Design a protein around this ligand. Structure first.
Ligand SMILES: CCCCCCCC/C=C\CCCCCCCC(=O)O[C@@H](COC(=O)CCCCCCCCCCCCCCC)COP(=O)([O-])OCC[N+](C)(C)C
Ligand SMILES: CC(C)CCC[C@@H](C)[C@H]1CC[C@H]2[C@@H]3CC=C4C[C@@H](OC(=O)CCC(=O)O)CC[C@]4(C)[C@H]3CC[C@]12C
Ligand SMILES: CC(C)CCC[C@@H](C)[C@H]1CC[C@H]2[C@@H]3CC=C4C[C@@H](OC(=O)CCC(=O)O)CC[C@]4(C)[C@H]3CC[C@]12C
Ligand SMILES: CCCCCCCCCCC
Ligand SMILES: CCCCCCCCCCC
Ligand code: NA
Ligand code: NA
Ligand code: NA
Ligand code: NA
Lengths: 98, 91, 449, 73, 48, 48
């Protein structure tokens, strides 16, 4: 669940990044939506006073997304045998009731 | 009916006696009892009145506590104000 | 018997029903028990008919604060006022200055005993105070402030121990109060009086960082009741969200309320609930982001179209909210590094509006578009931060808050290393101060990424 | 060598970022929760963007300008 | 409740049903003291 | 020597659940049924 939430937040950031790229690079609602959705995913995985804020917002995005990932990694430790035994019973009884 | 006849003056507010009389007043309230003490504002009677007032303040929705104070008219200090001029006497 | 601290002998012989005495007959003996630190005798005289409120006259308090006040304690108080000043510290300093050169005399005596770390005397005096939870919390705050002075670490440790003791006392007393009554305890929670600087139980607990008092179930459910407003917490969250999206369903009885009224009080109570207001603000922020994206992608034609003016008005209301946050939080607002981001995003929006208003200029229009895209990224980052905080609003908030600062420091160190790497590359590859600075700053970021 | 040293120091800083919250329980996060929720509850509690009217009214007003509980306690 | 439960026929089932009912009643936030008492009784009957 | 099974008649149970049942407890039970309903909660509500 934690990694799923982190990936959802990354997808929201990717949508924002695609909107920004389309507003910067380019100037057809379906074409605009397709470009916004599929531009950052293909780009990442395949002008004087704007560079410093660009670096700053990249740093802020890295900070928030990395913190979400670390929360995903470490959140299960916040909140012993009985819990996992209950979960084991739940799963095994769910399969045995078929 | 509880007839409390104790020290008329110079009552030590020891924790044991405080607890004893608080429990007594609580029992009287729970059982719907009357407490017959003296009307004087001294010693044990003063503490009984204080505990009765505290119980009434704490539990307003519970049963009221009856604390009859049987005193002597010949020993009341600030008299001449209890006589009628419906009428409320400011003691 | 008092000079030798023989309490049992005094109780057995002096104070007996056979003997007679008056409350005013032991005034001087009470004074000398107070100044000689005989808490048992203070308690004995208090429970033997003496009235503390009438005994604590202005002359008695002045003598206690002038002649029987430690000079080391006064020096520590002065150091605290100069270095760790606070509202309660200022109030106590003013009180001490008044008594050195209603009025709550019992509070003054309690402060006199608290400042000098007279633990048992302070407990005896505190048992006679009117607002006892407030007195305990104020003592905890004052003692925690005095523990900050490093002139004498033994005195600071004693102050910290006494502060913990009084915090525990306040917690236990308020737990008893809440177990007895819930509405009366909550009235006592927000009770304010000029006794402790016009402060409050919750305010004093927060200022003193009394985590045990704040973490009380009574305080926590009081906060939950405040958060839900007039909406009962027994209603489901999805029901509240659905009534938020479907406004007419609020008056149809879908959402239960704590109290009862006119078909207008229901909507007023619903839409003034902090839970509802928060959810509505998040929804309207998402809608504003959608409008921003629409304007950027399809409504940029070198003239402000009505969507642009609507977006400008929404940003103006956001700026008003940010100004209110500035005014409320003072200079401490620009410490979270995420409030700074919101302020900088609003300023960047203002700059982009200025650039965009300069029509008949392709360069100005392109600069405005680029600034607006960067600000769209900033606003979505703010929404992502809101989502992150709301998801981890619980035991994981500590980890989240620590991780944010730690990753920020790591990224700052990476930026320092990147500046060094750019300087090295420029000194190796290349041989105009502005051009050199631009190359140094923007070479490693483009090269590595 | 300097690339290895830079990787070492930056990676150690990242790992410190990951693991530092564990060095130093319910009361702490409850206090933080109270702080955040009380900070939000202390606002005007007017839905956006209708809060601008409340702000204007407040600024206009600014420009123009017990024993029972204690006994129970 | 303990005295009555000592007389029940299905005692484990009664204890588990009491635990379930008390945990459900502890969800009501109208009175948190009553909810806490219900939670404590539910834990006691689960232990039983 | 008293037998609880025979003592617990329908009249006794009705008097206990009608006159000696707290109104606050009944309100909490109603809130639970409306908000945190369950199979056992429904069964207990029907019994009451
Ligand atoms: C850039 C382009 C424009 C932007 C587009 C962005 C789109 C974003 C749109 C939507 C995503 C919203 C995500 C919010 C996540 C944060 C909240 C969270 O985790 O906690 C909540 C998760 O429970 C929910 O609030 C579930 C929300 C489900 C929404 C389903 C899709 C709706 C469309 C609730 O937490 P909890 O612990 O259950 O609360 C305590 C419960 N208690 C009070 C009873 C004690
Ligand atoms: C478009 C609007 C109209 C109604 C809205 C829905 C109304 C109610 C909800 C329930 C809501 O769920 C909760 O808040 C549950 C929280 C919880 O119990 O943890 C999530 C958003 C959602 C699906 C809304 C999503 C956006 C919708 C579909
Ligand atoms: C416009 C479309 C895309 C729908 C968007 C829906 C969200 C904006 C809503 C749906 C459910 C809402 C949540 C429902 C419940 C809560 C719990 C609520 O209580 C707390 O966590 C406060 C702290 C605490 O009480 O412990 C805080 C708001 C939050 C996260 C809400 C935040 C806003 C959410 C995610
Ligand atoms: C755009 C700035 C990137 C800085 C370095 C981020 C490193 C993240 C490592 C995650 C394992
Ligand atoms: C330039 C030397 C690089 C060595 C490997 C570094 C790997 C770092 C992994 C961080 C997740
Ligand atoms: Na990134
Ligand atoms: Na990342
Ligand atoms: Na490197
Ligand atoms: Na690295």
């Amino acid at each position: 669940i934690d990694v799923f939430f982190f990936l959802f937040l990354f997808a929201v950031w990717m949508v924002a990044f695609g909107v920004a790229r389309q507003g910067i690079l380019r100037q057809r609602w379906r074409w605009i939506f397709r470009s916004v959705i599929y531009e950052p995913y293909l780009a990442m995985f395949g002008p004087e006073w704007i560079t410093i804020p660009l670096v700053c917002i990249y740093m802020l995005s890295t900070n928030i997304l990395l913190v979400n990932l670390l929360v995903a990694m470490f959140g299960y430790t916040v909140g012993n045998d009985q819990v996992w035994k209950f979960q084991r019973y739940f799963l095994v009884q769910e399969y045995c009731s078929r | 009916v509880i007839s409390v006849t104790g020290g008329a003056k110079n009552f030590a507010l020891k924790p044991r006696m405080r607890k004893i009389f608080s429990r007594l007043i609580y029992i009287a309230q729970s059982k719907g009892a009357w407490i017959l003490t003296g009307g004087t504002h001294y010693g044990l009677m003063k503490y009984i009145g204080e505990v009765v007032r505290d119980n009434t303040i704490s539990r307003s929705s519970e049963e009221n506590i009856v604390a009859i104070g049987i005193a002597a008219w010949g020993m009341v200090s600030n008299r001449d104000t209890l006589i009628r001029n419906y009428f409320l006497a400011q003691y | 018997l008092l000079e030798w601290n023989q309490l049992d002998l005094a109780n057995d012989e002096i104070f007996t029903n056979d003997r007679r005495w008056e409350s005013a007959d032991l005034q001087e003996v009470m004074f000398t028990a107070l100044i000689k630190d005989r808490p048992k005798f203070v308690r004995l005289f208090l429970e033997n008919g003496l009235n503390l409120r009438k005994f604590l006259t202005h002359d008695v308090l002045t003598e206690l604060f002038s002649n029987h006040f430690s000079t080391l304690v006064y020096r520590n108080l002065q150091i605290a006022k100069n270095s760790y000043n606070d509202a309660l510290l200022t109030f106590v300093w003013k009180l001490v200055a008044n008594f050195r050169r209603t009025r709550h005399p019992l509070q003054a005596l309690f402060i006199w005993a608290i400042l000098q770390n007279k633990k048992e005397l302070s407990k005896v005096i505190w048992e006679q105070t009117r607002g006892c939870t407030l007195a305990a919390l104020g003592a905890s705050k004052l003692l925690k402030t005095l523990a900050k002075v490093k002139n004498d670490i033994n005195a600071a440790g004693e102050s910290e121990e006494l502060a913990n003791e009084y915090e525990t006392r306040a917690v236990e007393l308020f737990t008893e109060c809440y177990s007895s009554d819930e509405d009366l305890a909550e009235q006592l929670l927000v009770y304010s009086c000029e006794a402790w600087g016009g402060s409050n139980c919750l305010e004093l607990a927060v200022e003193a960082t009394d985590q045990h008092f704040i973490a009380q179930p009574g305080v926590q459910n009081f906060l939950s009741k405040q958060w839900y407003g007039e909406i009962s917490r027994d209603t489901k969250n999805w029901k509240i969200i659905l009534c938020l999206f479907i406004i007419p369903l609020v008056g149809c009885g879908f959402v239960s309320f704590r109290k009862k009224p006119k078909l207008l009080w229901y909507y007023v109570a619903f839409f003034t609930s902090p839970f509802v207001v928060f959810s509505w603000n998040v929804v309207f922020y998402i809608a504003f982001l959608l409008l921003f994206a629409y304007v950027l992608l399809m409504d940029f034609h070198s003239v402000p179209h009505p969507p642009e003016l609507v977006l400008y008005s929404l940003v103006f209301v956001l700026f008003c909210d940010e100004v209110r946050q500035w005014y409320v939080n003072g200079v401490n607002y620009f410490t979270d590094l995420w409030n700074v981001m919101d302020t900088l995003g609003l300023f960047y929006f203002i700059a982009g509006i200025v650039f965009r208003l300069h029509s008949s200029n392709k360069s100005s229009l392109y600069s405005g578009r680029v600034i607006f895209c960067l600000d769209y990224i900033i606003f979505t980052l703010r929404l992502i931060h809101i989502f992150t905080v709301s998801r981890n609003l619980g035991p994981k908030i500590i980890m989240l808050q620590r991780m944010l600062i730690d990753v920020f420091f790591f990224l700052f160190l990476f930026a320092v290393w990147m500046v060094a790497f750019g300087v090295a590359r420029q000194g190796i590859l290349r041989q105009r101060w502005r051009w050199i600075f631009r190359s140094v700053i923007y070479e490693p970021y483009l090269a590595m990424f | 060598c300097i690339y290895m040293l830079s990787t070492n120091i930056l990676l150690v800083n990242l790992l410190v970022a990951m693991f530092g919250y564990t060095v130093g329980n319910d009361q702490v996060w409850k206090f933080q929760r109270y702080f955040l929720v009380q900070e939000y509850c202390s606002r005007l509690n007017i839905p956006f963007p209708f809060i601008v009217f409340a702000y204007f009214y407040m600024v206009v007003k600014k420009c123009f300008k017990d024993n029972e509980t204690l006994a129970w306690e």
